[PDB]
Amino acid sequence: ASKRALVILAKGAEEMETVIPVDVMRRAGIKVTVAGLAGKDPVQCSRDVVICPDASLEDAKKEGPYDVVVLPGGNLGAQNLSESAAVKEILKEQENRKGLIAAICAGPTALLAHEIGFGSKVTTHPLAKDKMMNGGHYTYSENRVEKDGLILTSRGPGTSFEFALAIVEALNGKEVAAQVKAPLVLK
Ligand SMILES: *C(=N)N1CC[C@@H](C(=O)Nc2nc3c(s2)CN(C(=O)CN[NH2+]N)CC3)C1
Structure with a gap:
């Protein structure tokens, strides 16, 4: 049947980083x-x-399980995700079930907060790098999208199409990702 995604929407979320993936x-x-x-x-x-x-x-x-849990960014949105006991339990479960987690821009700092995917290669927005690398629990990447096994991270609104298509490829394969990309008029 269809694959299933959960997008967690917190007050202060970056709307573009929310709507583009959705x-x-x-x-x-x-x-x-x-x-x-x-x-x-x-x-x-x-x-x-x-x-x-x-x-x-x-x-x-x-209504889980989900094939992917998606964390948008936004300064306050990422802070709210980082402070949520409920989000910690969902990410912990997803990790335990070898399920894809995807976080963009400031979104990956909630992985740090909930001790998720320690030792992964990750990217973040440049402005979130010092937060993400506090305590050296990840390896940093400058890739626009970084996928290290089931931890998929990206940098900003301008990488949101690449991030979303990388989720599609991971869940549905290259051909479905190419079909969705075709009419977007991406550069
Ligand atoms: C993409 N979603 N984002 C949101 C705005 C920009 C960004 O990351 N801005 C940040 N401002 C601060 C950050 S990240 C890290 N920070 C702390 O978390 C320190 N205390 N912990 N919450 C200071 C402000 C790109």
């Missing part, structure tokens, strides 16, 4: 659940775009 995954035929960290109520993003979640995280985490 839309590109849905174009690939992935069943995506946009799950509000704080419940099912609309979420105010970093630039004040308000997105209505499909479900609360409390509900969506009962």
